[PDB]
Ligand SMILES: Nc1ncnc2c1ncn2[C@@H]1O[C@H](COP(=O)(O)OP(=O)(O)OP(=O)(O)O)[C@@H](O)[C@H]1O
């Protein structure tokens with residue numbers, strides 16, 4: 001059961017990472033003050049990968 | 051109208067290069083620019 | 099009588115301010131500039147001092 005759990009979480013995380021990374025390109029270097037672009041960083045947490 | 055002029059001019063002038071003296075640590079003076087008591091503090095704009 | 103006054107404020111080697119002095123007005127001093135110009139940074143310098 002534990003193995004299966006870990007597996008499904010891994011799959012879900014990968015799918016969502018991919019979806020968000022694809023979405024990121026929906027932004028076109030907005031200009032706000034010294035801010036030149038906005039982005040979302042998605043990364044699995046090694047503390048959780050362990 | 052003088053004030054509404056000064057402002058605009060400065061807005062146009064500060065986009066054109068910088069003033070090199072500003073890195074010298076020597077403060078600039080308040081030069082009078084008309085009668086009635088108007089003053090300005092800015093170093094000369096040298097580096098375009 | 100004759101209230102003391104803050105005359106000037108000096109910033110040294112800050113982000114965007116290597117060396118900048120402002121002459122404090124006796125009544126009102128008005129900073130003006132675009133977003134991120136660093137006005138909040140100036141008031142910060144004051145209060146920290
Ligand atoms: N601690 C900090 N670390 C990194 N950048 C900073 C820091 N504090 C300010 N900045 C940047 O310095 C610049 C000045 O910010 P600041 O908010 O003072 O500007 P401003 O034009 O006065 O705007 P505001 O009206 O929001 O105060 C901006 O780019 C801000 O992102």
Ligand SMILES: [Mg+2]
Pocket residue numbers: 134135136137138139
């Ligand atoms: Mg600010």
